[PDB]
C-alpha cells in the first residue's frame, strides 16, 4: 500500500550545498551547484516541505547537523528528505575540509535511532561522484 | 517489528563507481532532471516512477561536452536504491 502523507507537515528537506572547498583537499569549486540548490528549494517548497538550505559545511558541521536534525521531534511530519550536493567517492561525501562516510550520516536516521521517523519514508538524494569510471555510452 | 534499515530510499545521481556530471552554468544533470520530473509528475506518479523518468531523461538527453577529450562525450545513468516498504505519493486524495 502506501505511506501516510497526510500528517500535519510534509516534513523537512535539508539541502547541503557544498560549493567551495579548502584547497588542501585538492577539490575544485563546484560551479553551477547554486542553481541546483535554488531549483531544489523551489521544487520542495511546492511539495510543502520546510526546506533548510545549508552552504559550504565542513564534515564536522555535516555530522553535527544530521545528528541534531535526527534528534528533532518528527512526530507530526510525514517524511524526511536530505539532499547532498558535493564532491564524493563510493560511499563518501565531502565536507569543505574532507570526506565523510555516507553511512555515518544515514545511520542517525535508522529505525531504532530516530524513533519519530520509524515507519516513515527517509529519502536521501545524492549528487556526487561515486568513483572515476567513465561511461562512454553506446549508440542505438 | 521492522528492520532498522527499512524505509530508506537513496536516489544516487550515478551508477556505483562512476563519475557524476554537472553543467558549470546550468547545474548537475541529475538535479536538473529530478526537479523537472517532480514539477511535471509529483501530482500524477508514484515516486519510483518519477525517478525512473529521471533515469530516462539523464540517460537519453545529456552527453558531456569537455575541452578535454578524456571527459568529452560521456554519459550517465542515475541509480535508485530503494529499501522502501510502501509506495510514496506526494499529493493527497
Amino acid at each position: 500500500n502506501s505511506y501516510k502523507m497526510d500528517y500535519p507537515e510534509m516534513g523537512l528537506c535539508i539541502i547541503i550545498n557544498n560549493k567551495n572547498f579548502h584547497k588542501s583537499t585538492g577539490m575544485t569549486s563546484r560551479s553551477g551547484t547554486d542553481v541546483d540548490a535554488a531549483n531544489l528549494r523551489e521544487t520542495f517548497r511546492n511539495l510543502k516541505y520546510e526546506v533548510r538550505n545549508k552552504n559550504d559545511l565542513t564534515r564536522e558541521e555535516i555530522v553535527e547537523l544530521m545528528r541534531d536534525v535526527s534528534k528533532e521531534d518528527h512526530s507530526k511530519r510525514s517524511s524526511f528528505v536530505c539532499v547532498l550536493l558535493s564532491h564524493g567517492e563510493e560511499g563518501i561525501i565531502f565536507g569543505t575540509n574532507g570526506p565523510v562516510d555516507l553511512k555515518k550520516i544515514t545511520n542517525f536516521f535508522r529505525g531504532d535511532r530516530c524513533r519519530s521517523l520509524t515507519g516513515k519514508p527517509k529519502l536521501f538524494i545524492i549528487q556526487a561522484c561515486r568513483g572515476t569510471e567513465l561511461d562512454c555510452g553506446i549508440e542505438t | 517489528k521492522i528492520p532498522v534499515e527499512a524505509d530508506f530510499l537513496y536516489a544516487y545521481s550515478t551508477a556505483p563507481g562512476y563519475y557524476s556530471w554537472r553543467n558549470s552554468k546550468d547545474g548537475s544533470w541529475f538535479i536538473q532532471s529530478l526537479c523537472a520530473m517532480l514539477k511535471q509528475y509529483a501530482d500524477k506518479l508514484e515516486f519510483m516512477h518519477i525517478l525512473t523518468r529521471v533515469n530516462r531523461k539523464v540517460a537519453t538527453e545529456f552527453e558531456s561536452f569537455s575541452f578535454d577529450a578524456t571527459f568529452h562525450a560521456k554519459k550517465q545513468i542515475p541509480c535508485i536504491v530503494s529499501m522502501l516498504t510502501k509506495e510514496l505519493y506526494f499529493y493527497h486524495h
Partner: peptide, 5 residues
C-alpha cells in the same frame, strides 16, 4: 562546460 563531481 560539463565538469565532473
Amino acid at each position: 562546460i560539463t565538469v565532473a563531481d
